[PDB]
Structure formats: structure tokens, C-alpha cells
Amino acid sequence: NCNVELALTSDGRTIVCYHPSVDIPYEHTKPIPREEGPMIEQLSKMFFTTKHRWYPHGRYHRCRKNLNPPKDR
Amino acid sequence: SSFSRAPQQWATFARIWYLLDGKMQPPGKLAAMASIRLQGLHKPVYHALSDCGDHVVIM
Amino acid sequence: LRNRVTDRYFRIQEVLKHARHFRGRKNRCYRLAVRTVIRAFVKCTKARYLKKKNMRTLWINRITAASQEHGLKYPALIGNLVKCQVELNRKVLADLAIYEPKTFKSLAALASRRRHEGFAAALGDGKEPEGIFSRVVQYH
Amino acid sequence: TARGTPSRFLASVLHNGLGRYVQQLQRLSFSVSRDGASSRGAREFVEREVIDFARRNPGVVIYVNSRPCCVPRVVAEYLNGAVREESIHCKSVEEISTLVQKLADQSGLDVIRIRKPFHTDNPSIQGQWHPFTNKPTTFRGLRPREVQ
Amino acid sequence: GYVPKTSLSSPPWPEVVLPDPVEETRHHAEVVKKVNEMIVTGQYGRLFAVVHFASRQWKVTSEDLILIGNELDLACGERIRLEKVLLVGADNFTLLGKPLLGKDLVRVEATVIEKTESWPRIIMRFRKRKNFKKKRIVTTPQTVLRINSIEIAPCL
Amino acid sequence: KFTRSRIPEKVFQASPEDHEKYGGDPQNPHKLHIVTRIKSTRRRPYWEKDIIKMLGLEKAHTPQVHKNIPSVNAKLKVVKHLIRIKPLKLPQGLPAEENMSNTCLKSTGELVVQWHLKPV
Amino acid sequence: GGQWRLQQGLAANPSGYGPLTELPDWSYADGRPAPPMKGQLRRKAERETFARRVVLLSQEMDAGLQAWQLRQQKLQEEQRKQENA
Amino acid sequence: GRIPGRQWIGKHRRPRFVSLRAKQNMIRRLEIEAENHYWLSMPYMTREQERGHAAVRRREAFEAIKAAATSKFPPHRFIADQLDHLNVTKKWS
Amino acid sequence: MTGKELFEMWKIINPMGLLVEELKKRNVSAPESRLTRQSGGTTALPLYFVGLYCDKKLIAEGPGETVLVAEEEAARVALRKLYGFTENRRPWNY
């Protein structure tokens, strides 16, 4: 997919790109219709990940955790 | 643009489902295309620590 | 003991304050720490060349993703942009792929147009007019 | 190293360059020693070059004292509150003048590692990429293998 | 020279025809005049600009900071007209250059805000079995600029 | 043994074929070589290392003018596979004292006393 | 795109001579030009040295060929003056 | 599947083969070499004309070398330095 | 306020309602919501773009983890675009 209008100036010195937002038409839209082992396995199958994500980590890793991290943007 | 910060973050990083038809194809070309799409290298967002994968259904 | 050392505590703590986030008697005991704070400062002093290399393959991965999403490959995109004389680098092109995709869409289209214009001149090599984006700017 | 150190993002203070440049320093607190060869240099600086410095920037008030708490020093206090204490034990007048100009030029934010060398807060103007920028829409919005 | 239809009768990629330069210059002049009219009417949003300062190229929007690893020898809070802008853009157009843009065309400006020194950066060499171990504390000078205004002129 | 290699001159006695392919003129020859070390004098014998040090080419990718006289040609012959050799073309005159400042060495090879960046 | 740039006659690297290094990266907003970068002063000094060496070697060549021609004419003149008398 | 002693040294070595890269690299270097032969092919002077055209310059450079080697001598000793060392015990009145 | 958003500077509730009454002031028909694009419609990580349309053309489209959140956030996007206080707006003239 690529749909733009490219051009040069007369001098051949700068390029001009022209490229507006194509919108989604009305027709292209649908309308709105209106135990620990089992525990970790059903989490894994609910979130499409594996069980080592859900097994805990000790006090030592949780203490190396940062709790007040910097925030940007 | 002009979405709120958390809805924009969600839509940027969400998980997308790809159907790939295996009739007559070679398993290695199938594997190449699905391997890229599973690591999330088909996203300009990609990084290894961002868990930016996507789902692939090979039928 | 006419004059012996009284400031050894502070020398010890000069190593141990960099060792404090280690794991084990590396973070406590001084022999173990010295050996492993040296290795950490060496690991830093090589990780600077590493960090430059790693960034630039991340940029190649991101530009490759976006240009394959627009029908190019990364070799085609960089090669034909340098032929059309836009001297953008990978860092800016990667940020343009993520943050500014309409501008990247135009860049991929221009790379395709330059590829096919330059290769039209290649197919008709010999006496032909110079290509439209194959016009170059040469400095006297 | 960089992991044994707190890090921060790149910051303004109060969007300091937007409307006007607000000199981000309030105070220098000098302390020089009267009978001291350690503070000979700071003595020479107060003798020679502090008048033109105070004249050069009127935003900062410069107090000097004699006989500090322990050692001759400068304590700059910046606008965002952070108080920097630099030591001019046994320095020449030249080094003292460069150190003072650095303090008066710097903003009060730390010298810890800065994560990113650029801080746009509105990065995207054509909208940040998401998986549905350029996947083309369909007729009645059907997904693949739809019966209808 | 006719070849019947086989696999390798043709290259797989679609032959795209290059239209003649007559209608292509028509198209180029038309698009350029449209963009220039949008600028004259002031129909853009905010602007970004890829700008080649110290040695690295920065994607620079309006009103935002940039950290540079050298001392520019300018007193703080000082206004600067960054030339070498080499791409500019809004939502509905971009005007990139070969390689730079026009100094009469795009205006990028920035104030020097601060000149600090960086964090203490360690340099450390060690060779095993050879008693080699050398430390060094490098700490570079840095400035921070604020990009104020990327204003654009309609001289296409 | 491995020994300092001597070259027959029949290698260098050129061809009109060559005078086509490279832009040379077998009469009215050029004045100055511009030499550039593209290769490294490591894993090369001590005489080649030292002849590079003589020529001034300790730094790679660094153009260096030399006289085109047979002595300099002989030293260039023994390091001829570590260096890239070009003529120094002079489209205008050789630079005067007024214009020692504005000089340029183009990629083509020529040196111009008018260095411009105003696009045409 | 290095060998393309060499075919065109630009240098292999855009970081060499070119408007993306030989133009002053900033100027004051009122219009006063900025003091030159030490990178560009160093390259202009390097080009001073290069032009100086080209001039020096060219004069050395011309003077050398001139002196050889002068010696040749002087020897022929001496031989004529000794065929005289 | 092994290699006997060490991989690259000795009687039996692991085979190594030439690829498109290695051939193409060798050939671009050989084409640079052919152009080197051509540009050394055409001298300007020969030995009889070059003999003596840099006598002035070579002897000038050697007088510079000789003079800078012979002018090696200890620096001067002043008074103001020694008295500036007395300026260490300076106190304000 | 440079850097922030309209609706974290002006805290509103029922943004679809605000859109509805403000369009009644504009004398344009009340908008329709449509489900423009989606993924993962039957797991706990869905994506929905719900678009707000009016008479065959749209005024907004927005994301959400469910249809209701997506619709109401697209209403926020529509309100931003109607008041002109978007992300692209011409930055302040200092």
C-alpha cells in the first residue's frame, strides 16, 4: 500500500510530498452488536503465554524491583 | 492521532491475528512468514523487550 | 608499628559502594567485590561500542518492518533514497517509521519511483534523457 | 556504572526556554578562609573576579563569609530547590572562575544519567503507528473466512 | 521478439509504465501549486523537521528539548536559527530536500537553555595475567537547546 | 626464502588499449600522483611498512601528492598493492597566493581553486 | 550507496566535503553568522597544506626541467666555442 | 564429524572454500591494481632530469634538523618564580 | 498547558452525551457508531476501533479494549476535533 502524490519544484532542488488522510467509508464498517496448578494453567490459556510468567518471585527480586520509576511523555 | 494516552498505547501495542493457508506451500516459507509475524518484526514498533508479538494461525 | 594505615576503611568503601547491588559475598566481602567491580567497569567501557552497534541494528529492524509493510525491502529503500539524494539516516528514518507514518509512506513511494525511473534509464541505456528524479545536484 | 546509578529523563525545569529564559540559580554561598593557604585561591577570586560576576548576572545573590563550618566552599542554591555544594579547597583563581561560571550556567537538575537526549512531548503529528494504519478495509468489514 | 506466455516469459514484478514527462510535469506543477496554496492559506497543523545539528540528525518538533554533546560557546537563553533543516512536514504534506531545504524556505529556531557537564563516565582497561588495569573518569560537556518555532515560508 | 620482490618493467610498459580504458595521455604526462593507502601494512614485510612511512602514508584513506619522478615511482612500485594512485588534474591554473585558501580536491581527482557549494 | 556516489563523482561518504559538513550549522536569529567550527577550520587548514604542497612540488618540477634544459644549451654552446678558434 | 589436531594448523586442516564474496573482493582489488600499474606507467622526468632539482630543499630540511638538534639546552631560571613560591603564606590584612 | 490534553485539563463525563448536544447545536443529525476495525473479539485482549459517523461520513475513530470504551473514546476524539483542540494544533506563538 502506497497512495501519494509526489512532485519536484521547477528548479529540481526540493521534493514535495502530498499525502492526506484517507478515511474509512460508511460502507466498510460493521455495526455494533449489543488449586494453584489449574489456576496458572487457566491464566496461561487465557493470556496465550506460559506458566513461568505467573509463578512468583521471591522477596529478593521483588526488592530489587524499582517502585518509583521515571516517567516520560 | 488525538487519542488519549492509554487508548493510544493500547492500540499501538495490541495483538493481531493472521491466517496463513498451508496448501501446497513449503513448510519453510510458511515458517519464515510466521516466524517474523510471531516475533513482531512486522511492526515498526519492534523491540525484544516490548513483548510485541502477534498471533498466527496456519491452517 | 611506627606508621601504619588508618584510612583503609575509606579505600574499602570506594570499592564496596559500587559493589552494593551485586549478589552474594560479592556485595559484602572485599576480595570478591574488587574482582567483580573491575569486571563491571570493563563491561561498561566495552558496552559503549556495543550500544552503538545495537542501536543501528534496531534501526535496521524497524525500517525493514515499515518498508516491507509498504512493499519495499530495506536494501531497495536505502539504496534508492541515496540515489535520489535524500541524506536521511537510520535513526530519523526509524523514528519516521514509528512516529510519522505518512511521511514514511511517501518516502517508500519515492524510493519505488526512483527505482523504476533509474531502471527505465538502465533499460534504455545509451542516448536517453536523464531521469526525472535521476537529475542530480553537483557542486562546483 | 549506569546500573549502579539512578537515571532520569531529559527535563526542562519550568519549560524554561519557552517564553523567557529564567536564570535557574538563586544563591551562591561562598566561604573563604582568612588565614589559610588552602583557601588562598578562593581568596584571590573574591579579591579579583567576584565583582564583575555579580555585575554580570543580577539574578543571583552572592553571600561570602569567613571561617566556614569546616572547609572553604561554594553552595549554590538553584531555582528548583536543589542545593549543590562544590568544594574549592586548594584551587587556583582560574579554576574557581570556571567552576563558578559552570554553576551559574547549569540548571539545578541532577548529573545522573539521562536516558534520552531528546524530549518531544508531542512526538507524532500524523499519528503514531498502530497495526491498523495501512491494513486495507473491506466490504461490510468482513474478516477472512467469513461466511457472510 | 514476441515470447509466448510461460513461467519465465517475464519477470515476476509488475512492469509499471513511466508516463511521459509532459503529463508528469503537469502533475508536478499541479501538486506544487496545491501545497503552496495550503501554506499561503496556513492550512497546516504543527510541523516537524529533520534537522542536522551537531553531527547527528534530530527529528525535531516545535517546543521541545535536544541535548548536544559539545559546548556551543553561547551564553544561556540565546536564540539560534538552525539552518541545515533537511526535511519538514505537517499532516497533509511534507517538503523534503536534496539534501537540504531552502534557507529562505524553512525557519527552525532554538534557544540554548543549559550548559551542563555529563554524568561521571568510567573508562577501565584490564588485561589478565599481565597486571594491566587502568581507570579514568571522563565527563563530557553538554548543552540543551529548546526548539521554539518551526515556521515555514510559501516559497516553492 | 621469502625475498624482496623485483618487478619486470614490461608490466609497466603500457598499451594503447589502456590509454583508451583509463584516461591517460602517453605524451604530455601528468605532474603529480595522488596516493591513498587503502590497505594495511600489517602482515606485510618490514620494508613495505617502512616505505609507507617514507611516503607519508601512515594514515589510511588520506590523499597525498607526490612527484611523478622515477625515484618516487620506484618506492610506489614496491608498495603498489597497498595504495590507490590517481593523477592530480588541474582544470584551472595551479593555485596562486591570493587563492591558497579556497581549494578543493574533488572525487574525480582534479584540484580546483574555486570551491563552491551554492547549488546550480 | 558508496559506489553510486563514486560513479556520480561525489565522495564515497556524505560526511566528507559537501553542504552537510561545509555549512555553518547555526546562526543567531537576528542574522549574525556564527563563529567557525573547529572541524571546518581544521579541514580548511588541511586544504591549505595540500595546496601549498601542490604549488611547491609544481615549482620544483618546472625549475628542475628548466635547469636541465639550461645545462644542455650551455654544454652545446661550450662545444661550439671549442670548435671555434 | 571432527578435525584432528587443531582446525587450521597442521597436516590435515578443516577445508575452507572460496565464495562469491572472496572472489569479488579479490577482483575489485585486482582492478585497483591494474589502474595502479597504468598510472605508474608514465614517468615525467627521468633520472638525468631529476638529478639535483631538490638540493636546496633537502639541505634546508637538514639544516632545520641539525639546528633543532643542536639547540638543546636547559631553560632559564628567573626570580619571580621563587618569590611566587613565597606567595603561598599570603593572608588578608 | 503545553504538553497536556483537553480532557485531562477539562474533566468531563458522558462524552457521547456532550457530543450529542453539541451536534444538536450544530443542527447535524445525531451520529451513528460503527465498528470500523477489530481484533481478538473473543479473548481478554481485544482491540476495537469504533468510528463515529454522521450521514455516510465520519467525524472520528477511536480505540478501546471493548466496544463501549472505544465508542466513548472516539466521542472524546470527535469532541477534540470539533473544538479544534487536537494534537496537531498550531502550537502557541510565544
UniProtKB/Swiss-Prot annotation, chain A:
Protein localization: Mitochondrion
GO terms, molecular function: RNA binding; structural constituent of ribosome
Origin: domain of life: Eukaryota
GO biological process: mitochondrial translation; translation
Keywords associated with the record: Mitochondrion, Ribonucleoprotein, Ribosomal protein, Transit peptide
A GO cellular component entry from the record: mitochondrial large ribosomal subunit
Disulfide bridge partners, by residue number: none
Family statement: Belongs to the mitochondrion-specific ribosomal protein mL42 family.
Subunit note: Component of the mitochondrial large ribosomal subunit (mt-LSU). Mature mammalian 55S mitochondrial ribosomes consist of a small (28S) and a large (39S) subunit. The 28S small subunit contains a 12S ribosomal RNA (12S mt-rRNA) and 30 different proteins. The 39S large subunit contains a 16S rRNA (16S mt-rRNA), a copy of mitochondrial valine transfer RNA (mt-tRNA(Val)), which plays an integral structural role, and 52 different proteins.
Protein name: Large ribosomal subunit protein mL42
The organism of origin for this protein: Homo sapiens
Gene: MRPL42
UniProtKB/Swiss-Prot annotation, chain C:
Pfam families named among the record's database cross-references: Ribosomal_L20
Biological process per Gene Ontology, one example term: mitochondrial translation
InterPro entries: Ribosomal_bL20, Ribosomal_protein_bL20_C
Keyword match Magnesium: no
Compartments in which it is found: Mitochondrion
Gene Ontology cellular-component annotations: mitochondrial inner membrane; mitochondrial large ribosomal subunit; mitochondrial ribosome; mitochondrion
Any one Gene Ontology molecular-function term assigned to this protein's record: rRNA binding
Record's keyword terms, sorted: Mitochondrion, Ribonucleoprotein, Ribosomal protein, Transit peptide
Keyword Glycoprotein: no
Main location per the UniProt record: mitochondrion
Entry similarity comment: Belongs to the bacterial ribosomal protein bL20 family.
Subunit structure comment from the entry: Component of the mitochondrial large ribosomal subunit (mt-LSU). Mature mammalian 55S mitochondrial ribosomes consist of a small (28S) and a large (39S) subunit. The 28S small subunit contains a 12S ribosomal RNA (12S mt-rRNA) and 30 different proteins. The 39S large subunit contains a 16S rRNA (16S mt-rRNA), a copy of mitochondrial valine transfer RNA (mt-tRNA(Val)), which plays an integral structural role, and 52 different proteins. Interacts with OXA1L.
PANTHER family, sorted: 39S RIBOSOMAL PROTEIN L20
Name of this chain's protein: Large ribosomal subunit protein bL20m
Lineage, uppermost ranks: Eukaryota, Metazoa, Chordata, Craniata, Vertebrata
Curated annotation (Swiss-Prot), chain D:
GO molecular function, one term: structural constituent of ribosome
Source taxon at top rank: Eukaryota
Segments traversing the membrane: none
Tissue specificity as recorded in UniProt: High relative levels in skeletal muscle and testis. Lower levels of expression in the heart, brain, placenta, lung, liver, kidney, pancreas, spleen, thymus, prostate, ovary, small intestine, colon and leukocytes. Expression is coregulated with TWNK.
Keyword match Amino-acid biosynthesis: no
GO CC annotation, single: mitochondrion
Broad class of where this protein is predominantly found: mitochondrion
Gene Ontology biological-process entries: mitochondrial translation; translation
Keywords: Mitochondrion, Ribonucleoprotein, Ribosomal protein, Transit peptide
Nucleus recorded as keyword: no
Location of this chain's protein in the cell: Mitochondrion
The family this protein is said to belong to: Belongs to the mitochondrion-specific ribosomal protein mL43 family.
Assembly and oligomerization: Component of the mitochondrial large ribosomal subunit (mt-LSU). Mature mammalian 55S mitochondrial ribosomes consist of a small (28S) and a large (39S) subunit. The 28S small subunit contains a 12S ribosomal RNA (12S mt-rRNA) and 30 different proteins. The 39S large subunit contains a 16S rRNA (16S mt-rRNA), a copy of mitochondrial valine transfer RNA (mt-tRNA(Val)), which plays an integral structural role, and 52 different proteins.
Protein name: Large ribosomal subunit protein mL43
Organism: Homo sapiens
Gene (name only): MRPL43
Full-sequence portion shown in this chain: 2 to 149 of 215
UniProtKB/Swiss-Prot annotation, chain F:
Name of the coding gene: MRPL30
Annotated Gene Ontology cellular component terms: mitochondrial inner membrane; mitochondrial large ribosomal subunit; mitochondrion
Protein name stated in the entry: Large ribosomal subunit protein uL30m
GO molecular-function term, one example from the UniProt record: structural constituent of ribosome
Taxonomy, superkingdom: Eukaryota
Family: Belongs to the universal ribosomal protein uL30 family.
Stretch of the intact protein here: 35 to 154 of 161
One GO process term, biological-process aspect: mitochondrial translation
Subunit structure: Component of the mitochondrial large ribosomal subunit (mt-LSU). Mature mammalian 55S mitochondrial ribosomes consist of a small (28S) and a large (39S) subunit. The 28S small subunit contains a 12S ribosomal RNA (12S mt-rRNA) and 30 different proteins. The 39S large subunit contains a 16S rRNA (16S mt-rRNA), a copy of mitochondrial valine transfer RNA (mt-tRNA(Val)), which plays an integral structural role, and 52 different proteins.
Keyword annotations: Mitochondrion, Ribonucleoprotein, Ribosomal protein, Transit peptide
Record flagged with keyword Lyase: no
Organism: Homo sapiens
